[PDB]
């Protein structure tokens, strides 16, 4: 439920929150099978990939429209380095506009110093590289090989 693709990046951590008719033993078995299916990718050095949550309350819906009532449910929340592709797309669309300086008269008009909307952008360019430098191998010094596997 954001457009960036969780296979372009890698998950860094997860949380799995369950409702209703639930078996901890089938949750165990499914998580362990997700850790087995490496089509779902996480980064290597975050071994305990998951937080688990399990509540008794059934699922719950409003009458007169929308979703139909169910007897068990799941929410899944996960940090990823693919968030960086959607932020890089937002920030390029900043650069394209800022290279003509469109819009930045309203931003001065209603208060902002121009050096602060200059600093934001290099901070978001730093964000692209904070998220790039976590998408790395079992290496802290120098030494990476040019072969890629993901």
């Amino acid at each position: 439920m954001v457009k960036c693709d969780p296979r372009h990046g890698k998950y860094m951590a997860c949380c799995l929150l369950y409702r209703g008719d639930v078996v901890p033993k089938d949750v165990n078995a499914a998580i362990a099978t997700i850790k087995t299916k490496r089509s779902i990718q996480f980064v290597d050095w975050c071994p305990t990939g998951f937080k688990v949550g399990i509540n008794y309350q059934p699922p719950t819906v409003v009458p007169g429209g929308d979703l139909a009532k169910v007897q068990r449910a799941v929410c899944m929340l996960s940090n990823t380095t693919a968030i960086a592709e959607a932020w890089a797309r937002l920030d390029h669309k900043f650069d394209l506009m800022y290279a003509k300086r469109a819009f930045v008269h309203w931003y001065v008009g209603e208060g902002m110093e121009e050096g602060e909307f200059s600093e934001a952008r290099e901070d978001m360019a730093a964000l692209e590289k904070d998220y790039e430098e976590v998408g790395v191998d079992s290496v802290e010094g120098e030494g990476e090989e040019e072969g890629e596997e993901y």
Partner: peptide
């Protein structure tokens, strides 16, 4: 009116973890 090419390269590595 619009600014030309200017020194803002922008995309440099800054803070590795």
């Amino acid at each position: 009116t619009p600014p030309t090419r200017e020194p803002k390269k922008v995309a440099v590595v800054r803070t590795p973890p």
